[model samples]
Target: IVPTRELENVFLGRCKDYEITRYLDILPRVRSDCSALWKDFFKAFSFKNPCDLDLGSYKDFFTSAQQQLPKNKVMFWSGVYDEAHDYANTGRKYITLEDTLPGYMLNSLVWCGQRANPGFNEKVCPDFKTCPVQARESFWGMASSSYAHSAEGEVTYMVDGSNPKVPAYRPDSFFGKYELPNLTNKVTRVKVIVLHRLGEKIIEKCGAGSLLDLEKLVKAKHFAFDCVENPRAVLFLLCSDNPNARECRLA
Candidate 1:
C-alpha cells in the first residue's frame, strides 16, 4: 500500500519505476510536473487551520496539476473501483481518475500531513476524520474538483444505485460537492449511469428515486442531462465476474 504522506513519491515515482508493468501509456505526462509538484502540494494546506481552511484552498496545487479530458472523454464515479484506468475506453471513450496527475497518485492510497508540521510526517499521519479537514479527503476534493473543471463537452458519471443514500450522490463526496459543482458550464451534457446486478439489493432507481436528486443537481449546474438504466458498459462490469459463479451468489 502507498502511504498517503508519500503520495508525491508514488505519483512521481511510478513514471520511471519500470516495475509498474500496468502503467498507462495514455496518461498525458509522467514527470513533466514532478519537480515542482511537492512544493505546490504541500504549500496548499500548510500551516492553515485544517478545520477552517477555505473550500478552494488547494487552488494552486490543483491548477498546476490539472489534466484535461478531450471533449466527451471523461468518466466520474462513486462507490466502485475499476483499479485500472482503461475503463469503458472503446465505446464510451471515458478516462478514469487515474488519467490525471493527482488522481494517479492517490489511487487506493492514503496520506495526511499534520497542520502543525505542514509537510507529511513519516512517523504519523492523520486519519480522515480526526480533525475538521482531513488530508486524504481534501486532497481528493481538490484533485477531483480540478479534474472536473477541465472536463469538456459530454461527460459520464456513475453512481452506486446500490448506494442507500437518499440523493444517490452523497453531498459530502469529492465527486458531488467539489468535482460536480466545478463542472459548471464546462460540461455540455451529463449522463448518469445507474449500475446494479441480479440479486443485489437495489436502493435507488431513475426518475422517482434518489437518482432524481442527481438530475436536479445537473440542471442546477446548468448542464443538459439524462439518466439511463443498465447501459451495456455497466452491464459488462457487473456481470463480467461470472454471474453464474458461486461468489456472485453471495448475499
Candidate 2:
C-alpha cells in the first residue's frame, strides 16, 4: 500500500504531464481542478505505510505523492449527498455483505451460445429463442433470455447453481481452491456493491476490516459506475480473483 502523500504526488505529476485542467469539468464537479480535489481527499484518510495503504506493493510512492498536496484544503470532492455514508447501499462504504462468505458457497458454470443454425432464421425464430427440444434435455440448460443480445454479437449466460451436490460447477472445483496470493495466504469470498449515489443505504452486515479491504480492492477492480448516464446499478460477488462475478440489481 502507498502512503497518501505519495499517491498525491503521483496524481499531480501525471496531471502536470497531461496538462488536463479543471477537475470540476469532469462529472459531478465538486471542486475547480484535479489538484484541488486530490489535496482534500487525501487529508481525510491516514496511512502508516504502504501495507497499511492496502495497495499491495509500490505503496511508498503513493504515500509520498499524497503528502505533497496542500494541507488546508478538503480532500474529498463529490456532488452526491451524504458523502460520508459508509454503508454498502450508499456507495461510500467499500465493503459489504458479499465479502464475508466461505469459498465453497458459490460455483461457476458456462452456458452455450445459441447461434443461428442452417435451419434457424434469426428474423422469424431468433437465435435466442429457445428451441423446445433443448429445454427438456438437461437441468442446467435453459432458454436464453431476450436481453442477452449484445451489440457486437449474441451473448450467452453462465449458470452457477448454489447447491454444490447437484452437478454444479463450484468455484473451488474449477480454481482448485481460493487462496490470497500475497500477505495472508487465505482465500477470500469478495462481494462488490454499487450504489446510485452517496446517500443511499445498504441494509447488510459488514465489518471494518472487510470494508477496508474492499476499499483497496475496488481500485484494483475498476469499481465505478455512472449514475447519470445509466441509472441502473449492479453488484458483484466472487469466490476467486476472476473479474466476472454473479451480478444482481439493487432494490
Candidate 3:
C-alpha cells in the first residue's frame, strides 16, 4: 500500500536525482520491446521519488517492477490526507477518503463510503425514498451550480448584482465581481448539488429504482453539459462576448 505522502515524496526525490543516461544506455537495443518498461521507469522517477527508494538505481528498479507487474495486480494508494494537505494549502478543503480514494487511482471502482461516518453517506447519497423533495431539489440545484463553475475553468465568480438576468460573473469578465467562497463551503455546496441533480435527473430521465437508467442520464448529461458549457466560458465569458452563446448551460 503506497500512502499518498510516501508516493509524492518518493516521486519528488527521484525527479531530482533522475538522469536520462541511466535509461538512455538501454534505450537503443530495448526501445521497442520495452517501451512500457521504459515509460514506467521515467514516470517512477519523474516526480523525484516521493517513496522510500531514495537512490536512483532503486527507484529505477521500482519503476521496472511497476512495468513488469500485471496491470490488474498492481495497486497504488495515495493517502487522501496527503492530497488534502496540498489542497488545504491552496485554500481548498481537505477531501474525505470516501470521496477521493476509490476513484483516485482506478478506472473502474466501487465506493464503499466512509466506515465511521454515517452522516457522509447520508449526506452524499441520501435515502431517496425518505429524503424530502425540497432536499432533493436543493441537491440537484447545487450540482448544476458546481457543474457550471467547473465548466468555466473551476474559477469562483462574483454574483453580479448589476446584471440580474445573469448575475454570476467569472474572473475574466469586465464589470465582473470576484467573491471567493470559503473552500469548505464551496465543496459542500458542490457535493450537495451534484448528488441532488444526479438523483433527480436520473429519476426523471429514467424510471425510478433503476441504477442503470440513472447512470445513463447522468453520464449523458454530464458529457453534454461539459461539452457545451466548457467551450462557451472559454470563448465568450472570458472574452466578454456579450449575449454570449445564449445556450451556455448557465443561461
lDDT of each: 0.64, 0.23, 0.25
Please tell me which model should have the higher TM-score, number 1 or number 2. 1
Q: How close is candidate 3 to the true structure, as a TM-score?
A: 0.15
> lDDT per residue, candidate 3, 1-251, as tens digits?
11233333343343322322222321112222234433444442233212212223223323232211111111111112232233323222322211221112221211112234321122233233443443323322222222222221122111111222321223222211111121212121111011111111222111223223323433443421111112322323333423333332361
lDDT of 2 by residue, 87-202 (tens): 22322322111111110011121112123232112123112234342322221111011001100111111122222232211222211111111112121222322222222233
Model 1, runs deviating above 4 Å: 1-8, 15-27, 30-32, 45-57, 83-86, 89-92, 114-119, 134-136, 165-167, 245-251
lDDT, candidate 1, 67-118, per-residue tens: 5467887888777555123355532356776755566555676554444653
Report how far residue 22 has shifted in candidate 1, in Å: 9.2
lDDT of 2: 0.23
Q: What 10-residue stretch in candidate 1 is worst by lDDT?
A: 15-24
- TM for every model, in the order presented, reads 0.77, 0.18, 0.15
Q: Highest TM-score among the candidates is held by which one?
A: 1
Q: Candidate 1: what lDDT?
A: 0.64
Residue 143 miss distance in model 1 (angstroms): 0.9
RMSD of each: 4.8, 22.5, 20.7
